[PDB]
Amino acid sequence: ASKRALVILAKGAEEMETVIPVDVMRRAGIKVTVAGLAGKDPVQCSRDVVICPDASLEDAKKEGPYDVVVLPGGNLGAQNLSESAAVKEILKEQENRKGLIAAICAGPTALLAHEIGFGSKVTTHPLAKDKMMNGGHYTYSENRVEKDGLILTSRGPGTSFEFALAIVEALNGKEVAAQVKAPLVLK
């Protein structure tokens, strides 16, 4: 049976950090749902790329649970995720069922806001470190991708391929990740 991914898309999301994981996961045969935080309408990302979600978050939640919940970064996107009660509920449920949670760049600061994964080793964008580390509830890492059990984090647009391939490896295994990677022409 195919693995399933929920990508939560908020206004101000970093479009590269949204598109790279969606695309790479789909290359891996993962069924990906791009879910709009605010509803079904197109979402204006951080650098003004407009993406049409597959579904509203409200509707995608009804088809859960998912093998991974993915939080893109972008400062304003992450703030919107952090302020959302629906996101809190989704992440709590995922944590409680021991499902994977993946967040990149400023995205991991939503884990802090929703009290998810405390005690984990995590990374973030360098500019988001102080926010993430407020209260010392996590241990900080400078690894490009950090995976501490079911909390998987990464640093920035330039680590998005590594982040995506780590999700693929977690869900579908090393060999599938290697096969998906080769045609991408990564360094």
Added chain:
Amino acid sequence: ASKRALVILAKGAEEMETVIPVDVMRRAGIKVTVAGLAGKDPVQCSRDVVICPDASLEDAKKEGPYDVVVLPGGNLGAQNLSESAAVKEILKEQENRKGLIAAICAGPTALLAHEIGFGSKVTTHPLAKDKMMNGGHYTYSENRVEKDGLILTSRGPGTSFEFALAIVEALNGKEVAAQVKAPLVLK
């Protein structure tokens, strides 16, 4: 005065190869127009990400010329670009005025279709090499990014940041490219 980029967006375009250059160029202060080949409606990219263009190609052409014309890859996207008379006209005009043309992955095969830049050194996705080299009208390179004068080409999703930063360097200079690069957390 700000430089201006036309990104031509066709059904089946590789969404990573579309979004990374748009985003990176906007980070560099370039005014980017995402122009829909088929008109103003949302475009279904290769891995099913749906992007809403800023304008139709017909409308964006009226605001030309641009400092760079950018052709994303994706096999089906590149085929749509290759079959388009409007694209032919845009690229001929750009070549004739000695403006930059940038293409990635299968994207450069549209240069072949429209007889653009013959004699240039070029790269493509490895799987697109035979198509590009039909007739020996270019010289092939395995460099991740190749720039031969005003023809700038690159290989794949995994070279999209390098491709984008090379466009930035060409238009705005080395120092701006370096400043835009640093916060991306590239290897």
